[PDB]
Design a protein around this nucleic acid. Structure first.
Ligand SMILES: [Mg+2]
Ligand SMILES: [Mg+2]
Ligand SMILES: [Mg+2]
Ligand SMILES: [Mg+2]
Ligand SMILES: [Mg+2]
Ligand SMILES: [Mg+2]
Ligand SMILES: [Mg+2]
Ligand SMILES: [Mg+2]
Ligand SMILES: [Mg+2]
Ligand SMILES: [Mg+2]
Ligand SMILES: [Mg+2]
Ligand SMILES: [Mg+2]
Ligand SMILES: [Mg+2]
Ligand SMILES: [Mg+2]
Lengths: 67, 151, 150, 70, 117
RNA sequence: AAGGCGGCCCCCUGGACGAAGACUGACGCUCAGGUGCGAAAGCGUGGGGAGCAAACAGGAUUAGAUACCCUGGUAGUCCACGCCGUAAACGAUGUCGACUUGGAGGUUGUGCCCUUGAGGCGUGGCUUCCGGAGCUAACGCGUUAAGUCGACCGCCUGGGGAGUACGGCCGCAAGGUUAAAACUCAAAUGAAUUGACGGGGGCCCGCACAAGCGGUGGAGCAUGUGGUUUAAUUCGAUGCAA
């Protein structure tokens, strides 16, 4: 059910990658729900953790403004 | 009113001139079904104010009527003691009728020599935007902007 | 202000439309207690007989027993001070088998006691329920309108 | 949330883009639920009721197509 | 006194009132208006027309500073989230940003209990 | 296992499932006493306390409002060690075994096929919805049975009195646990059916409102009703429908 991974076989989303990871967050720094992304239950679940790690490491913003 | 969308009944052809607006005005003015007396009075006031103004009779009546035909009124579709008032723009069909009703209401307010003289002054000053109908219209128009929170 | 004991339970029980500010005729201890001494207006009605609409229902706490020669009682039929112009309405629309006249409040005016009286019908539980229903429903409708408007 | 007007943009479309961005982000819908406190008991109740209704409406709509030709 | 070229408008709309204020660049406010201070009070002041009038009154009290651009920051849920913007645009301003700032907690402090009206 | 558990990271650890492989050889299920865990509220000690909030203060509606609403606000909610062991602790369904038609899914493994797309064919674990036979007073359950059985434990025998008092135990306390008797009653009950009602929802009609017009209530005039007075003011009609 990993629509964005069927032809790639990544099998593990890494928080280091941002180029193919910023497509799963909207302009306001919110994760696009799997209901819309069409992502597998495990792949979306680990991608959320990867995005959280990136936010902790200041790779992705928490909010749009983030003053 | 609920399921029927009525049309409109034809008005008198106005034998003197041929103005359906004049027919509507005389029908509003007349009371108790006494058409003869009301028509005579309105014709006499018709002549007096036309000869007082100087211009053409109907061409002056139309310009005096369009100057106190209102544009937006205030209504209240609320139930209970508390009420909210909403402005509604009048359609052209009801605009002339409301203007004529205001004119005839303001006519019976002066102690002149006769009803024709009562009509004449308040009919002629409408062209110059004076009298009682114009006075109430310039406040009805202000009522719309008095509280225009909901429209 | 000058307001003294008023009956609001009767005001709730009735929907009075009549308001007469007629006065009252009293003895000494009556006005003594009315100035200070708790004259009670609860359970008040008139007793129109001849031209003598006594306020039958009215209690009072006596100031003292100074008037020892004659023994008085709080339960006295206090008379009424009303114009003959309006006394005809009481001569008339009081005998309707369902109409009464009751006292609402009692106050002072230039050291004279005036007891307000009014003509009422009487509410039975099934219309008090409707009155409370409407009272709460107006509030609920206004609240719903405000919530919808946001 | 952050909507900067591009070069030579009408005010109407500039405000419309802001409104659409706010609607997509769901800002007005978050305050309406964070204004008051909702206990976990009623939160789970509402979630279960919403899921049941969403399931039932879809089932009824799909099952009503194979009946009542017109 | 001073003359600023461009500023930042702030909106603090709610379900009862609307506050529009003007800042120069950094945090120094140089003009503000409210819906309750424009004649409207109680239920009427929560209407978007009150917010629109307050925005006009605030824009008419900033002429001394002579600003021309307004980086608007909309905050608070209320009818004044668009009427104030319309009034500011009609008052002759060239807005540069339409930023929306909202204090949405991340499941932080407990909100007050629900009203059992 | 239940209660319950939601940023991220680290340290220790319990539990569940599957591909293939060998042994241990009935070691297997349940359980009166007993022990342990056990929502929140509550109590003791030592801290912490931003927001919320019992008690409490003020305002407001109401005949009254010791409430619902508004403005503040203490215990509490938080941390560590301690105490009670109460819940609609609910799937109102005690644990295990096998047998008894299907469809649509959810999550998580595994074998093979040209894996050109979340292509297909099988097989397991958990769980959701619909439903056949069967069961039930009905609602409903329906391979995760409330279908037919087997092994074990607990409980029920009319509604009140009452899970109340006494009595034994636990507990600093609040209280928990085991648990009656006298007296009264002809019922107390649950699933469903037809009406009626809802300050429940949806749709529709009528001068019922909205846009008019004219009147009534104001002051005599012609009538009937109520009470008044008299010997009678003869009797009936007493909401809309007098
Ligand atoms: Mg509040
Ligand atoms: Mg483990
Ligand atoms: Mg045991
Ligand atoms: Mg606790
Ligand atoms: Mg508080
Ligand atoms: Mg409070
Ligand atoms: Mg404590
Ligand atoms: Mg129990
Ligand atoms: Mg149970
Ligand atoms: Mg066991
Ligand atoms: Mg499980
Ligand atoms: Mg079923
Ligand atoms: Mg006990
Ligand atoms: Mg109601």
């Amino acid at each position: 059910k990993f629509c964005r991974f069927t032809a790639e076989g990544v099998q593990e989303i890494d928080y280091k990658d941002i180029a193919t990871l910023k497509n799963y967050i909207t302009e306001s720094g919110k994760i696009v729900p799997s209901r819309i992304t069409g992502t597998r239950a495990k792949y979306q679940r680990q991608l959320a953790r990867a995005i959280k790690r990136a936010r902790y490491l200041s790779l992705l913003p928490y909010t749009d403004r983030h003053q | 009113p609920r399921r029927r969308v009525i049309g409109q009944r034809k008005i008198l052809p106005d034998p003197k001139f041929g103005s359906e607006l004049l027919a509507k005005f005389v029908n509003i003015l007349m009371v108790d079904g006494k058409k003869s007396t009301a028509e005579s009075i309105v014709y006499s006031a018709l002549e007096t104010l036309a000869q007082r103004s100087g211009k053409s009779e109907l061409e002056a009546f139309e310009v005096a009527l369009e100057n106190v035909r209102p544009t937006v009124e205030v209504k209240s579709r609320r139930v209970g003691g508390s009420t909210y008032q909403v402005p509604v723009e009048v359609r052209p069909v009801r605009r002339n009728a409301l203007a004529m009703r205001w004119i005839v209401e303001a006519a019976r307010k002066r102690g002149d020599k006769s009803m024709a003289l009562r009509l004449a002054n308040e009919l002629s000053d409408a062209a110059e935007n004076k009298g009682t109908a114009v006075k109430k219209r310039e406040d009805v128009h202000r009522m719309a902007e008095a509280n225009k929170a909901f429209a | 202000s000058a307001t003294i004991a008023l009956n609001k339970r009767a005001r709730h029980e009735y929907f009075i439309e009549e308001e007469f500010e007629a006065g009252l005729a009293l003895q000494g201890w009556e006005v003594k207690s009315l100035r200070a001494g708790k004259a009670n207006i609860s359970d008040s009605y008139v007793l129109l007989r001849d031209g003598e609409a006594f306020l039958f229902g009215a209690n009072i706490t006596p100031m003292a027993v100074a008037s020892t020669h004659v023994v008085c009682d709080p339960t006295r039929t206090r008379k009424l001070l009303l114009n003959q112009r309006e006394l005809d309405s009481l001569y008339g629309r009081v005998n309707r088998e369902g109409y009464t006249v009751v006292a609402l409040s009692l106050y002072w005016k230039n050291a004279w006691c005036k007891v307000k009286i009014g003509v009422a019908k009487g509410k039975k539980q099934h219309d008090k329920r409707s009155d409370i229903k409407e009272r709460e429903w107006q509030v609920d409708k206004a609240r719903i309108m405000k919530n919808a408007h946001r | 949330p952050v909507i900067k007007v591009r070069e030579n943009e009408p005010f109407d479309v500039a405000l419309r883009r802001f409104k659409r961005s706010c609607e997509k982000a769901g800002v007005l819908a978050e305050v309406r639920r964070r204004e008051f406190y909702e206990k976990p008991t009623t939160e789970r109740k509402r979630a279960k009721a919403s899921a049941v209704k969403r399931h039932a409406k879809k089932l009824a709509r799909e099952n009503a197509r194979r009946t009542r030709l017109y | 006194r001073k003359q600023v070229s461009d500023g930042v408008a702030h909106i603090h709309a709610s379900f009862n009132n609307t506050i529009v204020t003007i800042t120069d660049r950094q945090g120094n406010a140089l003009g503000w208006a409210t819906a309750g201070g424009s004649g409207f009070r109680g239920s009427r002041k929560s209407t978007p027309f009150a917010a629109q009038v307050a925005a006009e009154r605030c824009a008419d009290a900033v002429k001394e500073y002579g600003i021309k651009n307004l980086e608007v920051m909309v905050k608070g849920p209320g009818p004044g989230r668009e009427s104030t913007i319309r009034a500011l645009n009609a008052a002759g301003f060239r807005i540069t940003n339409i930023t929306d700032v909202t204090p949405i907690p991340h499941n932080g402090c407990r909100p007050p209990k629900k009203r059992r009206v």
